[PDB]
């Protein structure tokens, strides 16, 4: 309910109206940390631990949807415990930094994102794996419709669920923030809160850049499965031919997405473009594979290329080959909106600086 | 049970939050304002149906462009906002948050929702925007924007007096169910 109505009942009558502000989010803090270690131990109870000693998938597969679940619960146990002991020591709670840096700093910092990276970068392939098996295995889809009609899933469902690690890390910030805002200024305590503050924001970056790696190289590893580099070993200019052992794995994706390739006399191609830290490559989507064919070159060099945005067209750039052997070719490409086309030239342009 | 989710999508302190709390409960935060709303199934009835919607906050999840996607697998209506005191959140729709509900939610009905309508008279609102040659969103505006995105509706509210918070529940709640 209220940090008010409850704790400091006869203390709240001393304070300033800053002082019970900062009361109340530093106790919605302390509330929702309790909180979810009762989800994460949901997680464990219901699904985990009952999940491996029933043998409902092989320990590998489990091992990929619940990596180290224990260590994420006591990542959080212990920091709700130190918050227990503060608040023991009485109903207005003081400075908070130390615990705060305790948590979100230094070594306490580099084990959170260790923890809350391995816990959550796979995760969205371990969900579609868990809903295939629910749709292959009536065994395992019983089990799921059992463990999720328990009451302390709160009529949820395991993949609504094991997202919480990841969303309790993203309020991190705006607690904080909020924590900062009825905090005197001028003051260590102050000070220490921002730079708590400013460490959550680099977690969240690690994370964010663990779970795009993992995913990336999965779909990679997709790509190069249904990667057909049949027109390119012989070809028809030695511009592409020594593209026909590509290897999308070897590479880093930067992004992807749908283009259209204005080619000829009002003639196009509906492509499907991966830009890569070194390469962009052009494929066609013949329904379930990823044509490299040729005339234009399918894969560009980032570091020959320069990026121009159409005068006319608010949807379509250029990309412009530099190297004097690779005769006038322009390659037009549309995005599929104007936004489209925006970050399409932002990360164009980026990458051929870097390359 | 007819389950059903929502995902509430926008800029930040366009008071995605504070919107879904008034929502679940009923009634505005008096005391304290919650920073934080955990995913929650909310019961809503439309048409004679009931439906467990489920809530799901992104407040936080702004600047990370890969942590957002992990919220929009199998999602049943999206809950798009811009806030009426910030023609910024506005232009956004089309240019940040269209196109990534379209990609990662192809088909998903999506209902445009401007907040704090109760600031489209505000005068001290009104000035801070008539500084940088802005002003307070027209409500033709955000139906225009509604169009233009392909939204399932369009709708307004303010939820610190909660006009129009249960409507715009009940417009998701049907746009999830077609």
């Known amino acids: ?355 | 049970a007819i389950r059903k989710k929502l995902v509430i999508v926008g800029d930040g302190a366009c008071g995605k939050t504070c919107l879904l709390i008034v929502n679940s409960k009923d009634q505005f935060p008096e005391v304290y304002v919650p920073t934080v709303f955990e995913n929650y199934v909310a019961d809503i009835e439309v048409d004679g149906k009931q439906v467990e919607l489920a809530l799901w906050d992104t407040a936080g999840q702004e600047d990370y462009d890969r942590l957002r996607p992990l919220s929009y697998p199998d999602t049943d209506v999206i809950l798009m906002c811009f806030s009426i005191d910030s023609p910024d959140s506005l232009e956004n729709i089309p240019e940040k948050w269209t196109p990534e509900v379209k990609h990662f939610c192809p088909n998903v009905p999506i209902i445009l929702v401007g907040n704090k309508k109760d600031l489209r008279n505000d005068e001290h609102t009104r000035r801070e925007l008539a500084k940088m040659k802005q002003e307070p969103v027209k409500p033709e505006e955000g139906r225009d924007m509604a169009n233009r995105i392909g939204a399932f509706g369009y709708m307004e509210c303010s939820a610190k007096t909660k006009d129009g918070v249960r409507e715009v529940f009940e417009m998701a709640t049907r746009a999830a169910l077609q």
Not at chain 1, 248 to 277: F, N
Not at chain 1, 294 to 303: A, I, R
């Open chain 1, 1 to 355: 309910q209220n940090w008010q109505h409850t704790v400091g009942k006869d203390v709240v009558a001393g304070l300033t109206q800053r002082e019970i502000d900062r009361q109340e989010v530093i106790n919605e803090l302390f509330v929702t940390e309790a909180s979810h270690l009762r989800t994460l131990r949901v997680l464990d109870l219901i699904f985990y631990q009952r999940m491996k000693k029933e043998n409902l998938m092989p320990r590998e597969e489990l091992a990929r949807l619940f990596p180290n679940l224990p260590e994420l619960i006591e990542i959080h146990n212990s920091w709700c415990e130190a918050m227990k002991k503060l608040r023991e020591e009485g109903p207005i709670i003081k400075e908070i930094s130390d615990l705060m840096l305790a948590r979100f700093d230094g070594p306490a910092r580099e084990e959170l994102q260790q923890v809350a990276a391995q816990f959550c970068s796979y995760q969205s392939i371990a969900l579609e794996l868990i809903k295939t098996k629910q749709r292959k295995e009536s065994r395992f889809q019983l089990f799921m419709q059992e463990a999720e009609s328990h009451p302390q899933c709160r009529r949820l469902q395991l993949r609504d669920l094991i997202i919480s690690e990841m969303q309790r890390l993203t309020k991190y910030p705006l607690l904080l923030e909020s924590i900062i805002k009825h905090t005197e200024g001028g003051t260590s305590e102050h000070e220490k809160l921002c730079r708590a503050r400013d460490q959550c924001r680099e977690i969240l970056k690690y994370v964010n850049e663990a779970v795009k790696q993992t995913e990336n190289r999965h779909r990679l590893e997709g790509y190069q499965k249904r990667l057909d580099a049949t027109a390119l070993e012989r070809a028809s200019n030695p511009l592409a031919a020594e593209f026909k052992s590509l290897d999308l794995t070897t590479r880093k994706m930067i992004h992807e997405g749908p283009l259209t390739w204005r080619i000829s006399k009002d003639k196009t191609l509906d492509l499907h473009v991966l830009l890569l830290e070194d390469l962009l490559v052009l494929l066609q989507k013949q329904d379930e594979k990823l044509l490299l064919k040729c005339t234009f070159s399918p894969v560009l060099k980032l570091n020959a290329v320069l990026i121009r945005s159409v005068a006319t067209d608010k949807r379509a750039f250029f990309i412009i080959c530099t190297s004097k052997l690779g005769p006038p070719q322009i390659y037009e490409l549309v995005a599929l909106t104007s936004s489209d086309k925006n970050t399409w030239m932002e990360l164009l342009e980026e990458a051929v600086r870097n390359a």
